[PDB]
RNA sequence: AUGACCCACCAAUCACA
RNA sequence: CACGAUAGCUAGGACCCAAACUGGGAUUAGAUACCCCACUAUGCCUAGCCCUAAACCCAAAUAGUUACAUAACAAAACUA
RNA sequence: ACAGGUUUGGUCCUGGCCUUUCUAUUAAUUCUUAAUAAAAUUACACAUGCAAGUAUCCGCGCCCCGGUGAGAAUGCCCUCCAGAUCUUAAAGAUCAAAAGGAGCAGGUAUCAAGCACACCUAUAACGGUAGCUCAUAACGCCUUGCUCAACCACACCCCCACGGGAAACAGCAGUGAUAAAAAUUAAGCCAUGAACGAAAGUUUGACUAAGUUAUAUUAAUUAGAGUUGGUAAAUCUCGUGCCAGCCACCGCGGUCAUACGAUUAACCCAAAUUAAUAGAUCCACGGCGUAAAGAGUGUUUAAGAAAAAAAAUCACAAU
């Protein structure tokens, strides 16, 4: 009687042969650590970002517009090298026409180059092999070509279509030939775009600026994006106030393949989301509403399964408790409910019950969505739940704010900032509330610190190592203060006995007792440490303990072993 | 309380005012874990002594009750 | 409220509702808000022509000249209104705008017989 | 010296055309 | 402002008899109670405090009326 | 209030709680189009743009409009007006600081005393009396814009702003944070107003006309929500079995549930409907033997009543 109309933005059908226009190439630059992606970029763009980058690392995807001498417009994507960012690279592979695979000469094909190969191969993207560091001493293009032949990438030398251009990034050796290689492959793909239709696009990175609010870096797939359009991405929407370019410039129009910063989002889009333009505000809200309703339905269903099980267990406990206990009438059920009378079930509603089990409550706040996702994948990797428990209470974009402090304060959390800030006020506030805010610009420092945190909470490993052993000989009954005290006369054989240490009693191989002496006394003197061959009188605090003539006694001491994290992150 | 019995599902919440309080979850069945944010409202539950708040079903992390499937 | 300076004035307050304007002719301090506090209400002017094609103006003449006599100042549109009524000579600007209007009608007449050709 | 708890009054017909 | 039962406090004096407390005896499952015996603080006098009572006739003071008029019970109902 | 439900085995009385009405915010669920009105979490921090100019040089304008409710029991109403400004010789007139007071003015008396808070002399000082406020609430503490053609206050903070923190949207838009709370980084000076100009005129995020939003009305193009034990309009068949759950209040669920959950039927509102929270309204010109309440006693003070007619006084156990 009421079926919800399906209204959501659907990516338009493929453009007609008539309106298809010459496009511009989008090129990802991928590969293993320190092989020179960013130095390539820098040299093309006449800029230095390899100098200014924090830690000399590329931690963020970025798009860059480059015009060449020939009039070639290329959009470059800079992908990070570390194993942590594998999510990012994947996204880069989806939005690209061409990839440039960078492999240094002195090293050759390695793990991240393999991963990159896999992403580009799975996304069905044309790839161009660029060997780097040919100005080096050990530079060997040939080795690299062989190792590439291993992974089913065929170089131009072997007849394969994959183009191999050896290049030195520092000296600018073959740069013209890589440029012309990309040019040729691009002219070969015959790339087309629809300028006239509405805007289909894709989100690179979404972050929050204090001045400009919510902002997204997005590469237009097709359509002209003009100021004042209405965009919809995933579960959130925007009207477009500014569309700006990375040097700060305000650009009035966006044409397909151009990277564009966008302003005016109501909520932050998930990085890697496809952007569809619509006709009005109310249309956009119809859409967002639909999508939310949909997700809530799916989640509701899974929840419905878990629930049904829980209440079927309860239902079974009820049927058991009722039928098994001999139904007659309900009042006689009340009376026959007295056959199982004492009911021992212990349940406490307090929140300090898990602290000794050593949970770790953790709040992540990163600079951009991509980064946050990276960190949460790293946390997904966590394999040891018997050791500690890694509990992510909250994650989000933007600098550390008052809400995050409070949140951490209730859960005894730790706030991990990443490429973000914490103002004075926030800091002193977390000082009052007993929260620690640890800020990190470098992702593996962050994960290190996570490990440090997990291990510091980890249960100290208790090891029992022996101190002394003494055999009982005679048993005495001594009267002191109107109390008969059993006294074990002992002869210390190997080792020594000390008063403060923990003791255990041994009967013919069995262990009878565990605990500490009440009185160790030797020849009318109380002596803390009896050496070897020394006779010592021993009175335990436990009166139930029987001392025979032939018993053995082992004095032991407990030393603490500090365990590190059982969790080793893959990266 | 005494005259009439069941076992009622409640949670403990911390509220934006910083005050921590027991609160009750309407409907049959629910999925709520620690760290979920909910929105609570003022109706007092008559059976439960002490429990003056109620989770709003259908907002944030408390979803509407799923019809039997 | 206490102001630094400014004079008594006869102006139009704008009452009305969107697209349907109405005016209360008013003697007010100069520095106070348009629709705000006033010293005395003087008249009303309804710009929209009514059922009979009349714009209704009301002027409390006695009080108007009492205030002019205390040296209140007139707004250009109140001036235009009084003048129209005949309680003041025509305001020069009414006359001039009339003339300009005539010359526009003339040049559109000629342009009409020039385009018709 | 004692003797779980719980128990009660809030709905109207038949017959004929 | 000046008083205010019993109990209670301070100091000095009294002491027949009564008596919290306590100690004995019964009783009882128990009996730190009721019942029996002893005995003390205290009840008395002088001086000073203390300011409490079911200090309740559970019905405010001062003038009046017996008209209108029954929630119940009680000591009838009411005016200023 | 025209009232209603609920104390008990029952009746009466007393006494609370709740229902029924009306509005606003928020939320849930639903949502077709117009018009009009209104637009509101934050005296926390603010990217960018704009919000004050005119004019033959001087000058004159430049929190005035607009913003906000932070502070303060502020204050309402009313005396009296220095000053500024306009006009004109003057006289007038508009806005009215300071100073005042017939009266009225948030809670709290478990805030009961304040501690110099008065007056004279006269010359403006010397000097002299020993006062002044307060149970008709002084002196404190808490909360707070308002009695609305409007008024009062603030203008980053240190009541103030020389200085010092430090580098200011509580102008329009925007944005972070924060909150249950979400309007355009828009167009024009065409009309009114304001500034300036002798003037044509220029400027003005005041404002005008628009944009956005079920917040409210209305109009039709629009059907969905809540409820059906009683109060209180309206129910049937299954499932469950003191479980799962429901309720504003009484209460419902223990195998024949009109009260849960779903179905059938119905009722009631309707582009809305429920829920939550704040209001509007609501207590005593009523009572005090037994229900909450006559303060253990008398005298006076302050304050009141006198409203017509008279009186003080004799066995007995005051102290
Ligand atoms: N000798 C030599 N050194 C080079 C060459 N290209 C880059 N390098 C050096 O390698 C280092 C890393 O370069 P970089 O641009 O950061 O590589 P990357 O792939 O972007 O590194 P990452 O972002 O994955 S961590 C730099 O210090 C640079 O000087 C080259 O062609 N020859
Ligand atoms: C105690 O004094 C000890 C006697 C134990 S031998 C049975 N001798 C010396 O210390
Ligand atoms: Mg790099
Ligand atoms: Mg928003
Ligand atoms: Mg029950
Ligand atoms: Mg409720
Ligand atoms: Mg929702
Ligand atoms: Mg209007
Ligand atoms: Mg017993
Ligand atoms: Mg009984
Ligand atoms: Mg006495
Ligand atoms: Mg005495
Ligand atoms: Mg004595
Ligand atoms: Mg005696
Ligand atoms: Mg005796
Ligand atoms: Mg005895
Ligand atoms: Mg005497
Ligand atoms: Mg008496
Ligand atoms: Mg009494
Ligand atoms: Mg009296
Ligand atoms: Mg009763
Ligand atoms: Mg009953
Ligand atoms: Mg009642
Ligand atoms: Mg809303
Ligand atoms: Mg104002
Ligand atoms: Mg104050
Ligand atoms: Mg004057
Ligand atoms: Mg004044
Ligand atoms: Mg305030
Ligand atoms: Mg101030
Ligand atoms: Mg400010
Ligand atoms: Mg100031
Ligand atoms: Mg603003
Ligand atoms: Mg300002
Ligand atoms: Mg915001
Ligand atoms: Mg609102
Ligand atoms: Mg929004
Ligand atoms: Mg104008
Ligand atoms: Mg003009
Ligand atoms: Mg403008
Ligand atoms: Mg219900
Ligand atoms: Mg049934
Ligand atoms: Mg009901
Ligand atoms: Mg039902
Ligand atoms: Mg409505
Ligand atoms: Mg009484
Ligand atoms: Mg009395
Ligand atoms: Mg008394
Ligand atoms: Na580097």
Tab-separated table of N, CA, C and O (backbone and C1' of nucleotides) in Angstrom, chain A residues 2 4-5 7 208-214 239 241-242 266 281-282 285 289 296 311 314-315 318-319 322 330 333 337 399 401-404, chain F residues 29-32 45-47 173-179 182 184-185 211-214 223-225 240-245 254-255 264 271:
chain	number	residue	atom	x	y	z
A	2	UNK	N	1.990	1.215	0.709
A	2	UNK	CA	3.004	2.252	0.575
A	2	UNK	C	4.359	1.606	0.281
A	2	UNK	O	4.943	0.928	1.130
A	4	UNK	N	8.140	2.761	-0.994
A	4	UNK	CA	8.925	3.983	-1.082
A	4	UNK	C	9.487	4.132	-2.489
A	4	UNK	O	10.166	3.231	-2.993
A	5	UNK	N	9.192	5.268	-3.121
A	5	UNK	CA	9.679	5.547	-4.468
A	5	UNK	C	11.199	5.558	-4.466
A	5	UNK	O	11.823	6.127	-3.557
A	7	UNK	N	14.258	7.137	-5.477
A	7	UNK	CA	14.794	8.355	-6.046
A	7	UNK	C	16.198	8.582	-5.529
A	7	UNK	O	16.398	8.952	-4.367
A	208	UNK	N	38.339	19.716	6.344
A	208	UNK	CA	37.658	20.895	6.843
A	208	UNK	C	38.620	22.048	7.130
A	208	UNK	O	39.531	21.942	7.951
A	209	UNK	N	38.393	23.145	6.420
A	209	UNK	CA	39.098	24.404	6.606
A	209	UNK	C	38.319	25.272	7.600
A	209	UNK	O	37.089	25.321	7.547
A	210	UNK	N	39.026	25.951	8.502
A	210	UNK	CA	38.372	26.838	9.460
A	210	UNK	C	37.683	28.016	8.779
A	210	UNK	O	36.636	28.468	9.228
A	211	UNK	N	38.285	28.545	7.723
A	211	UNK	CA	37.659	29.622	6.982
A	211	UNK	C	36.561	29.155	6.046
A	211	UNK	O	35.463	29.707	6.015
A	212	UNK	N	36.858	28.123	5.271
A	212	UNK	CA	35.997	27.767	4.158
A	212	UNK	C	35.018	26.636	4.442
A	212	UNK	O	34.286	26.209	3.557
A	213	UNK	N	35.012	26.133	5.668
A	213	UNK	CA	34.113	25.041	6.025
A	213	UNK	C	34.509	23.687	5.455
A	213	UNK	O	35.682	23.326	5.488
A	214	UNK	N	33.543	22.926	4.950
A	214	UNK	CA	33.850	21.614	4.389
A	214	UNK	C	34.309	21.773	2.958
A	214	UNK	O	33.691	22.500	2.180
A	239	UNK	N	25.852	22.910	-2.060
A	239	UNK	CA	25.662	23.912	-3.099
A	239	UNK	C	27.044	24.542	-3.266
A	239	UNK	O	27.798	24.627	-2.295
A	241	UNK	N	29.740	27.185	-3.548
A	241	UNK	CA	30.060	28.578	-3.313
A	241	UNK	C	31.363	28.931	-3.997
A	241	UNK	O	31.394	29.765	-4.899
A	242	UNK	N	32.444	28.309	-3.554
A	242	UNK	CA	33.702	28.454	-4.251
A	242	UNK	C	34.082	27.166	-4.931
A	242	UNK	O	33.845	26.078	-4.400
A	266	UNK	N	27.415	20.281	3.263
A	266	UNK	CA	26.790	20.268	4.592
A	266	UNK	C	27.467	19.243	5.493
A	266	UNK	O	27.658	19.487	6.682
A	281	UNK	N	17.980	22.180	-4.697
A	281	UNK	CA	18.123	21.804	-3.300
A	281	UNK	C	17.169	20.670	-2.901
A	281	UNK	O	17.616	19.646	-2.366
A	282	UNK	N	15.853	20.843	-3.148
A	282	UNK	CA	14.916	19.823	-2.675
A	282	UNK	C	15.180	18.466	-3.302
A	282	UNK	O	15.013	17.438	-2.638
A	285	UNK	N	17.909	16.882	-1.353
A	285	UNK	CA	17.479	16.352	-0.066
A	285	UNK	C	16.655	15.076	-0.220
A	285	UNK	O	16.790	14.156	0.592
A	289	UNK	N	18.039	11.748	1.626
A	289	UNK	CA	17.077	11.024	2.438
A	289	UNK	C	16.937	9.596	1.970
A	289	UNK	O	16.952	8.667	2.786
A	296	UNK	N	20.002	2.546	6.484
A	296	UNK	CA	19.340	2.226	7.739
A	296	UNK	C	18.547	0.935	7.630
A	296	UNK	O	18.452	0.177	8.600
A	311	UNK	N	17.087	-13.282	21.469
A	311	UNK	CA	15.805	-13.484	22.115
A	311	UNK	C	15.295	-14.911	21.963
A	311	UNK	O	14.377	-15.324	22.677
A	314	UNK	N	17.124	-16.419	25.008
A	314	UNK	CA	16.316	-16.071	26.175
A	314	UNK	C	15.021	-16.896	26.229
A	314	UNK	O	14.655	-17.435	27.282
A	315	UNK	N	14.348	-17.007	25.083
A	315	UNK	CA	13.099	-17.764	24.984
A	315	UNK	C	13.271	-19.217	25.424
A	315	UNK	O	12.416	-19.787	26.116
A	318	UNK	N	13.640	-19.521	29.091
A	318	UNK	CA	12.319	-19.393	29.701
A	318	UNK	C	11.549	-20.713	29.637
A	318	UNK	O	10.964	-21.152	30.633
A	319	UNK	N	11.548	-21.344	28.465
A	319	UNK	CA	10.877	-22.634	28.297
A	319	UNK	C	11.457	-23.716	29.189
A	319	UNK	O	10.715	-24.473	29.818
A	322	UNK	N	10.505	-23.051	32.825
A	322	UNK	CA	9.072	-23.257	33.070
A	322	UNK	C	8.651	-24.733	33.013
A	322	UNK	O	8.152	-25.283	33.996
A	330	UNK	N	-0.203	-21.805	38.000
A	330	UNK	CA	0.841	-20.803	38.201
A	330	UNK	C	1.182	-20.588	39.686
A	330	UNK	O	2.326	-20.270	40.018
A	333	UNK	N	3.106	-23.364	40.567
A	333	UNK	CA	4.387	-23.108	39.907
A	333	UNK	C	5.247	-22.205	40.794
A	333	UNK	O	6.475	-22.340	40.828
A	337	UNK	N	8.559	-23.637	42.426
A	337	UNK	CA	9.732	-22.838	42.074
A	337	UNK	C	10.750	-22.853	43.231
A	337	UNK	O	11.837	-22.281	43.123
A	399	UNK	N	40.600	19.324	13.817
A	399	UNK	CA	41.484	19.379	14.974
A	399	UNK	C	40.772	18.942	16.257
A	399	UNK	O	39.545	18.848	16.297
A	401	UNK	N	38.890	18.906	19.509
A	401	UNK	CA	37.899	19.834	20.071
A	401	UNK	C	37.370	19.336	21.403
A	401	UNK	O	37.734	18.253	21.852
A	402	UNK	N	36.494	20.121	22.022
A	402	UNK	CA	36.105	19.885	23.410
A	402	UNK	C	35.361	18.569	23.576
A	402	UNK	O	35.492	17.877	24.604
A	403	UNK	N	34.592	18.230	22.546
A	403	UNK	CA	33.797	17.013	22.535
A	403	UNK	C	34.649	15.777	22.620
A	403	UNK	O	34.315	14.826	23.325
A	404	UNK	N	35.760	15.803	21.901
A	404	UNK	CA	36.683	14.689	21.869
A	404	UNK	C	37.332	14.509	23.229
A	404	UNK	O	37.408	13.394	23.741
F	29	U	P	11.995	9.084	11.056
F	29	U	O5'	10.554	8.787	10.445
F	29	U	C5'	9.798	7.691	10.927
F	29	U	C4'	8.329	7.883	10.697
F	29	U	C3'	7.929	8.424	9.341
F	29	U	O3'	8.014	7.463	8.299
F	29	U	C1'	6.723	9.561	11.005
F	30	U	P	7.936	7.928	6.759
F	30	U	O5'	6.499	8.582	6.682
F	30	U	C5'	5.720	8.495	5.511
F	30	U	C4'	4.700	9.587	5.505
F	30	U	C3'	4.890	10.626	4.432
F	30	U	O3'	4.482	10.170	3.163
F	30	U	C1'	4.418	11.694	6.472
F	31	C	P	5.395	10.499	1.893
F	31	C	O5'	5.125	12.048	1.653
F	31	C	C5'	3.791	12.504	1.506
F	31	C	C4'	3.702	13.999	1.564
F	31	C	C3'	4.600	14.741	0.603
F	31	C	O3'	4.085	14.753	-0.712
F	31	C	C1'	4.731	15.742	2.725
F	32	U	P	4.979	14.210	-1.930
F	32	U	O5'	4.622	15.227	-3.093
F	32	U	C5'	4.659	16.621	-2.843
F	32	U	C4'	3.786	17.366	-3.813
F	32	U	C3'	3.930	18.876	-3.826
F	32	U	O3'	5.088	19.314	-4.522
F	32	U	C1'	1.642	18.300	-3.858
F	45	A	P	35.378	35.375	21.853
F	45	A	O5'	36.161	34.651	20.662
F	45	A	C5'	37.201	33.711	20.905
F	45	A	C4'	37.580	32.980	19.638
F	45	A	C3'	37.763	33.837	18.397
F	45	A	O3'	39.022	34.493	18.354
F	45	A	C1'	36.487	31.926	17.858
F	46	C	P	39.231	35.776	17.408
F	46	C	O5'	39.126	35.174	15.935
F	46	C	C5'	38.541	35.895	14.859
F	46	C	C4'	38.182	34.954	13.739
F	46	C	C3'	37.825	35.581	12.405
F	46	C	O3'	38.988	35.914	11.659
F	46	C	C1'	36.252	33.891	12.945
F	47	A	P	38.904	36.809	10.322
F	47	A	O5'	39.772	36.006	9.239
F	47	A	C5'	39.774	34.582	9.190
F	47	A	C4'	40.176	34.030	7.840
F	47	A	C3'	39.946	34.934	6.633
F	47	A	O3'	41.032	35.819	6.414
F	47	A	C1'	39.027	32.798	6.201
F	173	A	P	21.720	38.194	6.862
F	173	A	O5'	22.181	37.467	5.534
F	173	A	C5'	23.112	36.413	5.617
F	173	A	C4'	24.089	36.473	4.488
F	173	A	C3'	24.962	35.258	4.353
F	173	A	O3'	24.272	34.170	3.788
F	173	A	C1'	26.278	37.180	4.131
F	174	G	P	23.865	32.934	4.723
F	174	G	O5'	25.076	31.943	4.510
F	174	G	C5'	26.185	32.080	5.355
F	174	G	C4'	27.488	31.951	4.640
F	174	G	C3'	28.422	31.022	5.386
F	174	G	O3'	28.301	29.678	4.975
F	174	G	C1'	29.418	33.106	5.259
F	175	U	P	27.919	28.559	6.061
F	175	U	O5'	29.313	28.215	6.728
F	175	U	C5'	30.478	28.179	5.933
F	175	U	C4'	31.691	28.153	6.800
F	175	U	C3'	31.535	27.365	8.075
F	175	U	O3'	31.587	25.964	7.861
F	175	U	C1'	32.650	29.403	8.519
F	176	G	P	31.593	24.953	9.107
F	176	G	O5'	33.079	25.091	9.674
F	176	G	C5'	33.644	24.098	10.503
F	176	G	C4'	34.650	24.679	11.458
F	176	G	C3'	34.432	24.338	12.917
F	176	G	O3'	34.799	23.021	13.242
F	176	G	C1'	34.885	26.618	12.750
F	177	A	P	33.640	21.975	13.590
F	177	A	O5'	33.567	22.078	15.172
F	177	A	C5'	34.767	22.135	15.918
F	177	A	C4'	34.665	23.104	17.060
F	177	A	C3'	33.546	22.845	18.053
F	177	A	O3'	33.876	21.843	19.000
F	177	A	C1'	33.580	25.129	17.477
F	178	U	P	32.901	20.586	19.218
F	178	U	O5'	31.648	21.205	19.996
F	178	U	C5'	31.797	21.795	21.285
F	178	U	C4'	30.645	22.707	21.631
F	178	U	C3'	29.254	22.111	21.511
F	178	U	O3'	28.903	21.272	22.597
F	178	U	C1'	29.269	24.231	20.499
F	179	A	P	28.027	19.949	22.340
F	179	A	O5'	26.543	20.499	22.246
F	179	A	C5'	25.956	21.236	23.305
F	179	A	C4'	24.658	21.845	22.857
F	179	A	C3'	23.706	20.910	22.140
F	179	A	O3'	23.010	20.004	22.989
F	179	A	C1'	23.861	22.908	20.927
F	182	A	P	16.976	24.216	13.353
F	182	A	O5'	18.355	24.653	12.698
F	182	A	C5'	18.723	26.024	12.636
F	182	A	C4'	19.696	26.279	11.512
F	182	A	C3'	19.138	26.096	10.104
F	182	A	O3'	19.843	26.981	9.238
F	182	A	C1'	20.925	24.609	10.424
F	184	U	P	19.807	28.732	2.369
F	184	U	O5'	20.381	29.960	1.539
F	184	U	C5'	21.703	30.458	1.732
F	184	U	C4'	22.109	31.274	0.535
F	184	U	C3'	23.375	32.093	0.684
F	184	U	O3'	24.028	32.162	-0.589
F	184	U	C1'	21.573	33.526	0.219
F	185	U	P	24.875	30.916	-1.173
F	185	U	O5'	26.371	31.453	-1.234
F	185	U	C5'	26.647	32.798	-1.581
F	185	U	C4'	27.231	33.555	-0.415
F	185	U	C3'	27.729	34.965	-0.714
F	185	U	O3'	26.680	35.912	-0.613
F	185	U	C1'	29.266	33.773	0.715
F	211	G	P	11.127	34.099	-4.801
F	211	G	O5'	12.526	33.519	-4.314
F	211	G	C5'	13.527	33.236	-5.280
F	211	G	C4'	14.792	32.730	-4.659
F	211	G	C3'	14.645	31.618	-3.643
F	211	G	O3'	14.440	30.345	-4.237
F	211	G	C1'	16.145	33.239	-2.827
F	212	U	P	13.439	29.287	-3.556
F	212	U	O5'	14.117	28.968	-2.161
F	212	U	C5'	15.298	28.204	-2.121
F	212	U	C4'	15.738	28.010	-0.704
F	212	U	C3'	14.726	27.373	0.225
F	212	U	O3'	14.691	25.965	0.093
F	212	U	C1'	15.723	29.236	1.279
F	213	U	P	13.289	25.190	0.095
F	213	U	O5'	12.887	25.194	1.633
F	213	U	C5'	13.735	24.560	2.579
F	213	U	C4'	13.250	24.759	3.990
F	213	U	C3'	11.764	24.534	4.233
F	213	U	O3'	11.436	23.160	4.391
F	213	U	C1'	12.443	26.552	5.259
F	214	A	P	10.323	22.457	3.459
F	214	A	O5'	9.009	22.528	4.333
F	214	A	C5'	9.080	22.396	5.738
F	214	A	C4'	7.912	23.096	6.359
F	214	A	C3'	7.603	22.742	7.796
F	214	A	O3'	8.388	23.514	8.686
F	214	A	C1'	5.612	22.749	6.496
F	223	A	P	-3.509	12.365	-2.520
F	223	A	O5'	-3.287	11.527	-1.178
F	223	A	C5'	-2.155	10.671	-1.002
F	223	A	C4'	-1.979	10.250	0.442
F	223	A	C3'	-3.080	9.358	1.000
F	223	A	O3'	-2.566	8.610	2.109
F	223	A	C1'	-3.103	11.399	2.149
F	224	G	P	-1.610	7.323	1.932
F	224	G	O5'	-0.708	7.374	3.247
F	224	G	C5'	0.436	8.210	3.295
F	224	G	C4'	0.481	9.077	4.534
F	224	G	C3'	0.220	8.404	5.870
F	224	G	O3'	1.332	7.675	6.346
F	224	G	C1'	-0.905	10.472	5.796
F	225	A	P	1.161	6.661	7.582
F	225	A	O5'	0.922	7.595	8.839
F	225	A	C5'	2.016	8.247	9.450
F	225	A	C4'	1.545	9.102	10.587
F	225	A	C3'	0.994	8.353	11.782
F	225	A	O3'	2.006	7.875	12.648
F	225	A	C1'	-0.463	10.113	11.213
F	240	U	P	1.981	-19.083	20.415
F	240	U	O5'	2.417	-17.977	21.481
F	240	U	C5'	3.776	-17.596	21.620
F	240	U	C4'	3.917	-16.334	22.428
F	240	U	C3'	3.708	-16.483	23.925
F	240	U	O3'	4.879	-16.925	24.582
F	240	U	C1'	2.493	-14.611	23.125
F	241	G	P	4.935	-18.398	25.211
F	241	G	O5'	4.629	-18.168	26.752
F	241	G	C5'	5.151	-17.035	27.427
F	241	G	C4'	4.147	-16.437	28.380
F	241	G	C3'	3.778	-17.297	29.580
F	241	G	O3'	3.667	-16.482	30.738
F	241	G	C1'	1.819	-16.753	28.347
F	242	C	P	4.464	-16.902	32.064
F	242	C	O5'	5.177	-15.561	32.536
F	242	C	C5'	4.570	-14.292	32.309
F	242	C	C4'	5.156	-13.231	33.202
F	242	C	C3'	5.612	-13.732	34.569
F	242	C	O3'	6.749	-12.991	34.987
F	242	C	C1'	3.955	-12.082	34.855
F	243	C	P	8.208	-13.561	34.662
F	243	C	O5'	8.213	-13.727	33.082
F	243	C	C5'	8.623	-12.667	32.240
F	243	C	C4'	8.923	-13.184	30.866
F	243	C	C3'	9.295	-12.156	29.810
F	243	C	O3'	10.680	-11.835	29.861
F	243	C	C1'	7.749	-13.745	28.943
F	244	A	P	11.241	-10.404	29.383
F	244	A	O5'	10.585	-10.179	27.958
F	244	A	C5'	11.229	-10.694	26.812
F	244	A	C4'	10.404	-10.448	25.590
F	244	A	C3'	10.071	-8.993	25.312
F	244	A	O3'	11.116	-8.304	24.642
F	244	A	C1'	8.118	-10.302	25.146
F	245	G	P	11.661	-6.896	25.195
F	245	G	O5'	10.591	-5.855	24.642
F	245	G	C5'	9.806	-5.059	25.520
F	245	G	C4'	8.368	-5.016	25.074
F	245	G	C3'	7.539	-3.835	25.545
F	245	G	O3'	7.768	-2.633	24.825
F	245	G	C1'	6.340	-5.787	25.955
F	254	G	P	-2.203	-13.368	31.648
F	254	G	O5'	-1.053	-14.159	32.433
F	254	G	C5'	-0.250	-15.157	31.795
F	254	G	C4'	0.029	-16.347	32.695
F	254	G	C3'	-1.207	-17.046	33.279
F	254	G	O3'	-0.981	-18.455	33.382
F	254	G	C1'	0.218	-16.395	35.022
F	255	U	P	-1.250	-19.443	32.139
F	255	U	O5'	-2.835	-19.658	32.098
F	255	U	C5'	-3.712	-18.635	31.630
F	255	U	C4'	-4.186	-18.866	30.210
F	255	U	C3'	-5.108	-20.063	29.980
F	255	U	O3'	-6.076	-19.675	29.014
F	255	U	C1'	-3.298	-20.184	28.490
F	264	U	P	-5.214	-5.984	7.169
F	264	U	O5'	-6.692	-6.191	7.742
F	264	U	C5'	-7.616	-7.050	7.086
F	264	U	C4'	-8.903	-7.213	7.864
F	264	U	C3'	-9.773	-5.975	8.044
F	264	U	O3'	-10.554	-5.657	6.902
F	264	U	C1'	-9.597	-7.123	10.103
F	271	A	P	-5.653	20.294	5.855
F	271	A	O5'	-4.561	19.865	4.759
F	271	A	C5'	-3.380	20.638	4.514
F	271	A	C4'	-2.187	20.109	5.278
F	271	A	C3'	-0.850	20.785	4.980
F	271	A	O3'	-0.083	20.860	6.189
F	271	A	C1'	-0.652	18.477	4.631
